[PDB]
Design a protein around this ligand. Structure first.
Ligand SMILES: [K+]
Ligand SMILES: [K+]
Ligand SMILES: [K+]
Ligand SMILES: [K+]
Ligand SMILES: [K+]
Ligand SMILES: [K+]
Ligand SMILES: [K+]
Ligand SMILES: [K+]
Ligand SMILES: [K+]
Ligand SMILES: [K+]
Ligand SMILES: [K+]
Ligand SMILES: [K+]
Ligand SMILES: [K+]
Ligand SMILES: [K+]
Ligand SMILES: [K+]
Ligand SMILES: [K+]
Ligand SMILES: [K+]
Ligand SMILES: [K+]
Ligand SMILES: [K+]
Ligand SMILES: [K+]
Ligand SMILES: [K+]
Ligand SMILES: [K+]
Ligand SMILES: [K+]
Ligand SMILES: [K+]
Ligand SMILES: [K+]
Ligand SMILES: [K+]
Ligand SMILES: [K+]
Ligand SMILES: [K+]
Ligand SMILES: [Mg+2]
Ligand SMILES: [Mg+2]
Ligand SMILES: [Mg+2]
Ligand SMILES: [Mg+2]
Ligand SMILES: [Mg+2]
Ligand SMILES: [Mg+2]
Ligand SMILES: [Mg+2]
Ligand SMILES: [Mg+2]
Ligand SMILES: [Mg+2]
Ligand SMILES: [Mg+2]
Ligand SMILES: [Mg+2]
Ligand SMILES: [Mg+2]
Ligand SMILES: [Mg+2]
Ligand SMILES: [Mg+2]
Ligand SMILES: [Mg+2]
Ligand SMILES: [Mg+2]
Ligand SMILES: [Mg+2]
Ligand SMILES: [Mg+2]
Ligand SMILES: [Mg+2]
Ligand SMILES: [Mg+2]
Ligand SMILES: [Mg+2]
Ligand SMILES: [Mg+2]
Ligand SMILES: [Mg+2]
Ligand SMILES: [Mg+2]
Ligand SMILES: [Mg+2]
Ligand SMILES: [Mg+2]
Ligand SMILES: [Mg+2]
Ligand SMILES: [Mg+2]
Ligand SMILES: [Mg+2]
Ligand SMILES: [Mg+2]
Ligand SMILES: [Mg+2]
Ligand SMILES: [Mg+2]
Ligand SMILES: [Mg+2]
Ligand SMILES: [Mg+2]
Ligand SMILES: [Mg+2]
Ligand SMILES: [Mg+2]
Ligand SMILES: [Mg+2]
Ligand SMILES: [Mg+2]
Ligand SMILES: [Mg+2]
Ligand SMILES: [Mg+2]
Ligand SMILES: [Mg+2]
Ligand SMILES: [Mg+2]
Lengths: 64, 146, 118, 205
RNA sequence: UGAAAUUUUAGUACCUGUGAAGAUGCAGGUUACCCGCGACAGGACGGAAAGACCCCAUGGAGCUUUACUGUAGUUUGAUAU
RNA sequence: GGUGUAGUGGUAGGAGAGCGUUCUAAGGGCGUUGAAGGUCGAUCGUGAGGACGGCUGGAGCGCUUAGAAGUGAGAAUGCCG
RNA sequence: UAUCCGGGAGUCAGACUGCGAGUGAUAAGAUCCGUAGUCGAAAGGGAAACAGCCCAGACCACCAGCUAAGGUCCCAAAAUA
RNA sequence: GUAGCGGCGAGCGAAACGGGAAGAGCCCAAACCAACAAGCUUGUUGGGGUUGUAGGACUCCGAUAUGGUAGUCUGUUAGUAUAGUUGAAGGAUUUGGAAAAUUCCGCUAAAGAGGGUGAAAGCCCCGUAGACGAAAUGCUGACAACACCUAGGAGGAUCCUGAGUACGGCGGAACACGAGAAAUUCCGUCGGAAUCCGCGGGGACCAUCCCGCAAGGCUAAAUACUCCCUAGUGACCGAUAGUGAACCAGUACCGUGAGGGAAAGGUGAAAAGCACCCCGGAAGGGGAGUGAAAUAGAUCCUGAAACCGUGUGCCUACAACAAGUCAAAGCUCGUUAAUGAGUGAUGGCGUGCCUUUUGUAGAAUGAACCGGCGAGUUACGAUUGCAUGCGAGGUUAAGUCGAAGAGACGGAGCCGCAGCGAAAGCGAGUCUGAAUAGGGCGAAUGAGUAUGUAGUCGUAGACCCGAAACCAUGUGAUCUA
């Protein structure tokens, strides 16, 4: 059968032009009083999936 | 070629590797699986992305965004491709399709200014970038919105 | 496409058994015992092809020592004297002379003693 | 290129010219090999099956209790190690046919035909006409043309009497110009083709 | 007349020591001509039973309750008849 | 192909190159003047393995190239004899 | 030789010895680290036997030679130097 | 594997558009009219009518045609199924028991598919190509026959157009959609409409617009499967295989019963299956015969290994042996003729194989021995390497024709050529931001795609064997309570 896509990942990541995966940042839901404004400002920015994590999950996003 | 002298191109075909066929082959006994453990069992191994119970990366990360029901994507064409036509040519979505430049137009053709235009053309497309329109006009041509 | 066992298995086992010919009872009659003993024989044979050189050098040294003592000299003194006298005849030839050509061995011993004295 | 044209009587007529795009290309050995392998595989029927431990008759109950008997633990008398038990994996019905790119197919056909022409194993005859089918007469025709190895006789559609007289010969394989294949051309040591057949072949390719 | 459990092959000693730390098989020494028969049961950690004790498995099953979630029954009301 | 230098223990495991088995296609062969198979031999190759001869045997089988696998057993208290 | 990019893994029970500490009793073939070596995955020589100690890394042939640790009266090669 | 669903986990997962196979549309209820009977309506029958660019009734006109059928044991006809007939061409030579094999000359082919015949046959036989054939019964198609459907235009004043229905509440269920914002569809319960200025749907809901007309019914083809019958096919099995069953197999046997469930093929070309004689009670042998062969004698082709036994070339009764290896006298023998073979006094060294372990000769595990069988495979996807074709392009899928082939057509569709953003949107840029700033992701800085093959992975039993168990049908009170 067709290989299925991991819907959770599909919702949380985006494929970039270079083949990488763009992702959100954790610790951006609540309890912002426990983080400095610098932390919040720098977590607002997106990021890319690390090499090790990408090698673990790529097969689940092949046909995203 | 003769049926009694067939010869595949070098490197075109390889020999399948069979495991569990003696020790000297390098994959005897354990068949390259190692010793015991979950990965050494038939049907063994954990599901993709599983991390042994540590919260997986997708669980850590938050969901984001939404998909627009009325999303419109335009087939994109550039001045470099437009240069393939002759001066005075009437470029149309049908013309592009027949030429094979745009097999699938999606919501319609949008023209971008990645390349450098050189031919005078009358270009008809769903949309035009500002730079693309200026380049077409500078090349002596004209643009119309279908 | 089914490939039944055929005769390859018998051929392989018969080769092992022929190698095992002459072994005691089951060790030459039965394939499994034969293979185990043949493997041990291979191990012993490889080890012995190196031990054999050691053993023969040992035998030559013993015989040369006996001959040297009869000529009034120890094996160590004789070898040191021959080295000083530039003699390169090896222990195999020395033992051969001692057993067969006593006169030749005596001449070698005389030269060795002369070199030692000098 | 140009190939000598012979009359059925065996006397040679003036040459004829063949399209260079078809009979004048450089043969591509690897492409021809791929076509041959693919065609041979497609010929396979692939009907072959074995019964796994589920498909074998019976074998439901546990032969004996797990512990106590002193015997090796078993689950069914039809397990693969059991005599008469199921087969582990083994052949299962499936198709061996695959398809090449159309360009590869066309190149392979042109390559085999051009190889025949280059080696001069292509014999073009003005026409093969028999008022009635007679294998002796067709055999005499081959003798006139001086053909004694394996020959592929290519005939334009409708030359039924020629086909009937030629088919029964052991060294001859008859095919219509509309239905010619890489395997047929390669298998044949020589290719005897009528002028109309060559024209139809060129049109098809 | 005629089995069986067992059985890696065995030309199958003792002491001290060594060794996965308790050796017929390894080291040193000692003892011992070859093959049996009738008896004994020290050893072959003897045979028999993939230890039941103990621990482990994100195993099973039976049982309990103010564990959780359900539920048959029982009861109460609305409503239809 | 030659010279030189260096290197060539190895479990898990990775890479490469090969042997052998059944079958398919093509070519080229072998067989009641004896195939396969069995057995014996003091044979050849670096290895898996390959020949050759004697005897038994009585009808099918190699070889080269390529292709496909129910393709290699010594162990599973494996199954059957 | 290092990086980097990618295909394929196995490994997550370690052991001992020397040295530096802890725990222990300045006990353990104990336990837990740091450090180096060996075994693990290493045959060979010595330590009688003796995975982890000392010397030393087996691609093969030789009835050739020189040495390492360790040794030279006999078992047992070499000095009753 | 998209949109979505989902302790938003594990997973589940569409539909429309587009391309194809096949194609077919029709009948009522109601209004209205007539007949009949009862009790002006009220039931039966007939006529009439079947719809959304609203239709029908009804009222005018004009037509009494034109076409069709998804009807019939109605006939006629053609074909076909169920037996069959015909169907070319070789003799010698050598070996051999036997010729098809060898050699020499021939012959046939619309037949050189295949099978059998004393070994391997185009020409010996059965067949094959081809030609021909049906008294009888089926089946199919056509023809006719019968039968049944088939009307156009115009006006709306009124009438009809499916009620306990649609819908709503509550509780469930099906829709990929798990109550969620929830459409749509279905069930149970209760409430409960409108009706052409009407009604439903377009994913809560309202308005506009668009599309359609429920609560009645029927309908061939394309699709699914094969217990069977016929004709074939196989890089399918070849007697531990292949159906459990090649053989008197669901048999023997086991169980109270449900149920479970085997083993077992081969003489020879032809029985020519050993007349007769001898030992023996027979069995079984030895002759004599048959046969090419009887060590092919019915336990019958071949006849391996374990295991047993006979004969003997060498060794062995002072020896402590993982059974060997290295060295070696003696004796014996003469080979793929090799610096040979067998045996071996004696001396040196030396604790099996496998598994699992830090470590095993291990007093840890497994194997009594021999033989056979017995474990990473295939399908569909993902990705990487290698290879081929083409190349800013690559490529067809279903499907039609075709030998179960290749191949041709089929461009719908898929990947690539533009990215950025959650999105509107902009675009070699874009997002953030007040910013022409910085920064992120991209372009400059270009190769992809189809297929083959291999490695790995995913869904599948997924390398093989093994639970205690769980669940759903059944069979058991002939033991025992
Ligand atoms: K995210
Ligand atoms: K947070
Ligand atoms: K591996
Ligand atoms: K042990
Ligand atoms: K005892
Ligand atoms: K229990
Ligand atoms: K297999
Ligand atoms: K076994
Ligand atoms: K340490
Ligand atoms: K999908
Ligand atoms: K979960
Ligand atoms: K009507
Ligand atoms: K005959
Ligand atoms: K025949
Ligand atoms: K009939
Ligand atoms: K709903
Ligand atoms: K509608
Ligand atoms: K026989
Ligand atoms: K004997
Ligand atoms: K010995
Ligand atoms: K034990
Ligand atoms: K900016
Ligand atoms: K920027
Ligand atoms: K390529
Ligand atoms: K590939
Ligand atoms: K499986
Ligand atoms: K797998
Ligand atoms: K009773
Ligand atoms: Mg902090
Ligand atoms: Mg393959
Ligand atoms: Mg390995
Ligand atoms: Mg093994
Ligand atoms: Mg294991
Ligand atoms: Mg482990
Ligand atoms: Mg592991
Ligand atoms: Mg946790
Ligand atoms: Mg086997
Ligand atoms: Mg040395
Ligand atoms: Mg000790
Ligand atoms: Mg002891
Ligand atoms: Mg010993
Ligand atoms: Mg015990
Ligand atoms: Mg246990
Ligand atoms: Mg064979
Ligand atoms: Mg196998
Ligand atoms: Mg066995
Ligand atoms: Mg310790
Ligand atoms: Mg280990
Ligand atoms: Mg060592
Ligand atoms: Mg070890
Ligand atoms: Mg080395
Ligand atoms: Mg020296
Ligand atoms: Mg000495
Ligand atoms: Mg005939
Ligand atoms: Mg002939
Ligand atoms: Mg649902
Ligand atoms: Mg309701
Ligand atoms: Mg509704
Ligand atoms: Mg809407
Ligand atoms: Mg409408
Ligand atoms: Mg139908
Ligand atoms: Mg058999
Ligand atoms: Mg069977
Ligand atoms: Mg015989
Ligand atoms: Mg027999
Ligand atoms: Mg004595
Ligand atoms: Mg003696
Ligand atoms: Mg342990
Ligand atoms: Mg055992
Ligand atoms: Mg009763």
């Amino acid at each position: 059968p067709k290989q299925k896509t991991h819907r959770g990942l599909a919702k949380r990541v985006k494929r970039t032009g270079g083949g990488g995966l763009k992702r959100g940042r954790a610790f951006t839901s609540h309890r912002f009083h426990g983080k400095t404004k610098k932390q919040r400002r720098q977590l607002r920015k997106a990021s890319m999936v690390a090499k090790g994590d990408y090698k673990r999950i790529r097969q689940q996003l092949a046909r995203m | 070629m003769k049926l009694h002298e067939l010869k595949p191109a070098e490197g075109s075909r390889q020999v399948r590797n069979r495991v569990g066929r003696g020790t000297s082959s390098g994959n005897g006994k354990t068949a390259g699986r190692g010793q015991k453990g979950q990965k050494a069992r038939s049907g063994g191994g954990v599901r993709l992305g599983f991390e042994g119970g540590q919260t997986p990366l997708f669980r850590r990360l938050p969901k984001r965004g939404f998909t627009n029901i009325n999303r419109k994507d335009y087939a994109v064409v550039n001045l470099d491709t437009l240069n393939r036509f002759e001066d005075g040519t009437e470029v149309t979505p049908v013309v592009l399709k027949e030429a094979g430049i745009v097999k699938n137009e999606k919501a319609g053709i949008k023209v971008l200014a990645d390349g450098e235009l050189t031919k005078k053309l009358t270009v008809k497309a769903a949309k035009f970038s500002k730079s693309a329109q200026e380049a077409i006009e500078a090349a002596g041509g004209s643009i119309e919105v279908i | 496409a089914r490939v039944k066992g055929g005769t390859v298995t018998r051929k392989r086992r018969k080769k092992v058994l022929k190698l095992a010919k002459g072994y005691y009872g089951s060790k030459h009659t039965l394939f499994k015992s034969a293979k185990e003993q043949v493997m041990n024989s291979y191990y012993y044979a490889f080890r012995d092809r190196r031990q054999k050189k050691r053993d023969f050098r040992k035998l030559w040294i013993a015989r040369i020592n006996a001959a040297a003592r009869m000529n009034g000299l120890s094996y160590s003194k004789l070898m040191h004297g021959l080295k000083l006298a530039e003699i390169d005849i090896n222990r195999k030839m020395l033992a051969d002379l001692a057993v067969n050509d006593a006169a030749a061995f005596t001449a070698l011993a005389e030269q060795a003693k002369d070199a030692l004295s000098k | 290129p140009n190939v000598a044209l012979f009359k059925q009587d065996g006397t040679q007529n003036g040459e004829i010219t063949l399209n260079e795009e078809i009979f004048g290309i450089e043969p591509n050995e690897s492409v021809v090999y791929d076509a041959i392998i693919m065609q041979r595989a497609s010929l396979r029927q692939g009907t072959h099956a074995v019964k796994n431990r589920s498909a074998v008759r019976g074998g439901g109950r546990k032969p004996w209790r797990q512990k106590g008997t002193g015997r090796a633990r078993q689950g069914s008398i039809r397990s693969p190690q059991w005599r008469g038990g199921g087969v582990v994996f083994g052949p299962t019905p499936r198709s061996y046919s695959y398809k090449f790119p159309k360009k590869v197919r066309r190149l392979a056909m042109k390559s085999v035909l051009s190889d025949k022409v280059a080696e001069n194993n292509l014999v073009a005859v003005e026409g093969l006409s028999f008022d009635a089918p007679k294998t002796k007469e067709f055999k005499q025709v081959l003798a006139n043309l001086s053909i004694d190895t394996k020959v592929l006789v290519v005939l334009e559609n409708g030359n039924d009497f020629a086909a009937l007289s030629a088919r029964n010969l052991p060294n001859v394989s008859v095919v219509t110009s509309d239905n010619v294949s890489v395997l047929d051309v390669v298998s044949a040591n020589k290719v005897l083709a009528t002028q109309t057949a060559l024209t139809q072949i060129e049109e098809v390719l």
